[PDB]
Amino acid sequence: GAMGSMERASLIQKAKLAEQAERYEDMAAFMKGAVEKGEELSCEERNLLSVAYKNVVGGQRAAWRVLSSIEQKSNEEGSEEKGPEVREYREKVETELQGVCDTVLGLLDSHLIKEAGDAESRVFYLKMKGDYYRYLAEVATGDDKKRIIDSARSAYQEAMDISKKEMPPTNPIRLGLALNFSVFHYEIANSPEEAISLAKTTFDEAMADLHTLSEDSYKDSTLIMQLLRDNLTLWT
Amino acid sequence: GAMGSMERASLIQKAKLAEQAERYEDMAAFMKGAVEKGEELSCEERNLLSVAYKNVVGGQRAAWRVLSSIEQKSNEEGSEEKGPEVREYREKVETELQGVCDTVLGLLDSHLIKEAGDAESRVFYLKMKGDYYRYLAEVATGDDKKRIIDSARSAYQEAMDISKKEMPPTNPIRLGLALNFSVFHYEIANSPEEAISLAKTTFDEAMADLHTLSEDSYKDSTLIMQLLRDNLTLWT
Amino acid sequence: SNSL
Amino acid sequence: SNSL
Ligand SMILES: [Ca+2]
Ligand SMILES: [Ca+2]
Ligand SMILES: [Ca+2]
Ligand SMILES: [Ca+2]
Ligand SMILES: [Ca+2]
Ligand SMILES: [Ca+2]
Ligand SMILES: [Cl-]
Ligand SMILES: [Cl-]
Numbered sequence: 084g085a086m087g088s089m090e091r092a093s094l095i096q097k098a099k100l101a102e103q104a105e106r107y108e109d110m111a112a113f114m115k116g117a118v119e120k121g122e123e124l125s126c127e128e129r130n131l132l133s134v135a136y137k138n139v140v141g142g143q144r145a146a147w148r149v150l151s152s153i154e155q156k157s158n159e160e161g162s163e164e165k166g167p168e169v170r171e172y173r174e175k176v177e178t179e180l181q182g183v184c185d186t187v188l189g190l191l192d193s194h195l196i197k198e199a200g201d202a203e204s205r206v207f208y209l210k211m212k213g214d215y216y217r218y219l220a221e222v223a224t225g226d227d228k229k230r231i232i233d234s235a236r237s238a239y240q241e242a243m244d245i246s247k248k249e250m251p252p253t254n255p256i257r258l259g260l261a262l263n264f265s266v267f268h269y270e271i272a273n274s275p276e277e278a279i280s281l282a283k284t285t286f287d288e289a290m291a292d293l294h295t296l297s298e299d300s301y302k303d304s305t306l307i308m309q310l311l312r313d314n315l316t317l318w319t
Numbered sequence: 320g321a322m323g324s325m326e327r328a329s330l331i332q333k334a335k336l337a338e339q340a341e342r343y344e345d346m347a348a349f350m351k352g353a354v355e356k357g358e359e360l361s362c363e364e365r366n367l368l369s370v371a372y373k374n375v376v377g378g379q380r381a382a383w384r385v386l387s388s389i390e391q392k393s394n395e396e397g398s399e400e401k402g403p404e405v406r407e408y409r410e411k412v413e414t415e416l417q418g419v420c421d422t423v424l425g426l427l428d429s430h431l432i433k434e435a436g437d438a439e440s441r442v443f444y445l446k447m448k449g450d451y452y453r454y455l456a457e458v459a460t461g462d463d464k465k466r467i468i469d470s471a472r473s474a475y476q477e478a479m480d481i482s483k484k485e486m487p488p489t490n491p492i493r494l495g496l497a498l499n500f501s502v503f504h505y506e507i508a509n510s511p512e513e514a515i516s517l518a519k520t521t522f523d524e525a526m527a528d529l530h531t532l533s534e535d536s537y538k539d540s541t542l543i544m545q546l547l548r549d550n551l552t553l554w555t
Numbered sequence: 556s557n558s559l
Numbered sequence: 560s561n562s563l
Contacts, residue, residue, distance in 0.1 A: 096404045100389065104382035106412070146340035153336065168332045176342070214558075259559040266556045278556075310557050317556060450562075495563040502560045514560075546561050553560060 086116025094120075098131050107138035111183075118190050123198055129207050136187050140218055143180040147222060150176055177222050184215045191215075202249035203256060209242035210260040213267065220271050232271055239264040252288035253296060258307040261285040265311070269318060279318055286311045322352025330356075334367050343374035347419075354426050359434055365443050372423050376454055379416040383458060386412055413458050420451045427451075438485035439492060445478035446496040449503065456507050468507055475500040488524035489532060494543040497521040501547070505554060515554055522547045 086094055094117040101110035114132040118124065124132065150173035156162060157169055191212050199205040216235035223231050243264060246257040261281060269278035289308050293301055322330055330353040337346035350368040354360065360368065386409035392398060393405055427448050435441040452471035459467050479500060482493040497517060505514035525544050529537055 093402070093404050096401070097408050100386060100405065100408050103389070104385040104412070105378075106382050109408075109411075142341075146342050149340040150336060153339070165332070166329070168329050169336065172333050172336050172345075175345075176340070263558050266558045269556050307559070310559065314556050499562050502562045505560050543563070546563065550560050 084116060084119055086112065086119070089116060091117055091120045091122065095128060095131070098135065102131070102134065107135055107142075110135035111139050115186065115190065118195065121194075123204070124195070126203065129204065132190075133207075133211060136183065136215075140180060140183050140187075140215075143176060143183060144218065144221065147173065147176050147180055180222065181219060184219050187215045188212065202245055206242045206246045206250070206256050206260060209238050209245070210256070210263060213239035213242060213260075214263055217263070217267050217271055235267055235271065239267060251292055251295070252285070253292045253300070253304040255303045255307055258285065258289060258304060258311070262307060262310055262314070265314065269314075275318060279315065282311045282315050282318075286315070320352060320355055322348065322355070325352060327353055327356045327358065331364060331367070334371065338367070338370065343371055343378075346371035347375050351422065351426065354431065357430075359440070360431070362439065365440065368426075369443075369447060372419065372451075376416060376419050376423075376451075379412060379419060380454065380457065383409065383412050383416055416458065417455060420455050423451045424448065438481055442478045442482045442486070442492050442496060445474050445481070446492070446499060449475035449478060449496075450499055453499070453503050453507055471503055471507065475503060487528055487531070488521070489528045489536070489540040491539045491543055494521065494525060494540060494547070498543060498546055498550070501550065505550075511554060515551065518547045518551050518554075522551070 089097075094113045098110050098113040098117065101107070101113060110131070114128075114135045117128065118132065150169065154169045154173050157165060191208055196205070196208045196212070199208050213235045216231055216238060220228065220231045220235055239260070242260050246254070246260055250257045252258075262285070265278045265281045265285070267278075268274040268281065286308055289304060293304065296304060325333075330349045334346050334349040334353065337343070337349060346367070350364075350371045353364065354368065386405065390405045390409050393401060427444055432441070432444045432448070435444050449471045452467055452474060456464065456467045456471055475496070478496050482490070482496055486493045488494075498521070501514045501517045501521070503514075504510040504517065522544055525540060529540065532540060
């Protein structure tokens with residue numbers, strides 16, 4: 084790897100600089116280099132890794148949606164044939180997106196998840212595994228779409244089982260996992276009722292635990308609760 | 320070049336798709352491929368080339384400014400020594416930015432400018448040459464800073480001489496050239512009075528020519544005139 | 556739908 | 560300063 088010669092601490096420092104500069108591709112490459120040093124990641128370092136790849140894949144997903152919409156309109160009746168270019172370029176963006184997801188999934192499998200023993204790290208990584216399989220599922224159409232969806236579901240489910248046993252209902256990692264699993268149910272798994280039920284139960288159990296929190300923790304938890312409510316408002 | 324196997328028309332089509340998808344690096348690579356086909360560019364194609372590289376270099380310039388500001392703060396008295404990482408990463412972004420400018424300047428020199436005979440194409444390309452030398456000047460510090468500044472000035476000056484002879488004072492290319500040359504004077508050449516005089520004279524001569532324009536041309540010209548006014552308000 |  |  085091109086980051087193999089850089090110190091772990093220097094890679095982390097540069098990832099933080101890249102974030103300030105909105106250079107998320109650089110940020111992800113620095114954090115990949117840091118993971119490949121082989122040491123476990125701290126809470127702050129896990130968040131840097133997630134922010135970097137979330138921004139990279141977010142740009143790819145947005146571009147893929149634009150191109151997919153153009154491609155489907157070209158297949159409507161009355162549409163003028165324009166040749167292979169729209170499909171080719173959508174496929175180009177799609178392949179790049181799949182490559183980023185495969186990179187993240189590879190870091191999780193070699194070897195972040197297997198060394199993560201604490202609930203906070205293990206749930207974080209399993210949620211990430213669910214998220215990246217979910218992004219693969221958004222573009223999947225072939226022999227493996229079903230297996231990709233089940234891989235996302237399985238990772239989210241293992242993360243949920245640990246979170247329910249080991250974390251309070253207001254824990255922001257637990258809340259963000261439930262939020263994203265609910266989005267998986269609604270957008271990927273054709274299960275809007277499961278999505279609504281999960282979001283409602285997560286919100287209500289968090290509500291009942293807010294009294295235990297400091298002012299700062301209260302702000303962290305209620306911010307994510309608002310996203311659950313925003314989805315429930317959209318879905319009902 | 321990696322675009323050597325793609326049709327000129329397909330490259331242009333994909334550049335337009337990349338713009339819709341906000342994939343400006345892809346857009347620039349497609350337009351570079353189109354230029355390298357060796358044919359002259361139409362007005363619309365020139366604008367695609369400019370939009371693509373303006374967005375690529377704009378992201379690099381914004382990142383460079385963030386990192387440069389952090390680097391200078393690290394050199395203030397009382398600042399804790401953090402090692403070479405800030406300088407290294409600023410240099411990395413700077414080298415990438417310089418590479419993009421060199422790429423654009425190379426396209427202009429081989430061979431866009433020499434084949435551009437009409438005022439609209441020749442002024443457009445010479446303005447671009449001034450702009451990319453200006454972006455190089457923003458980061459220059461060494462033996463050549465003076466020569467980079469003079470290269471920008473010379474390109475802008477040749478573009479101005481043609482524009483004054485061949486285009487009306489409301490022509491949007493002429494107006495955008497004068498705007499950018501005025502920014503060169505203020506930001507690069509330490510000549511705020513020249514910047515203010517150029518902006519004022521350009522605005523006033525355009526004002527007096529608006530009566531000749533259609534409603535659509537009036538909108539095009541007045542939009543750029545407003546940028547001249549915004550700068551004059553900032554500078555005086 | 557809004558994810559995290 | 561604002562450029563084009
Ligand atoms: Ca070391
Ligand atoms: Ca461990
Ligand atoms: Ca616990
Ligand atoms: Ca051909
Ligand atoms: Ca010619
Ligand atoms: Ca003329
Ligand atoms: Cl393509
Ligand atoms: Cl670096």
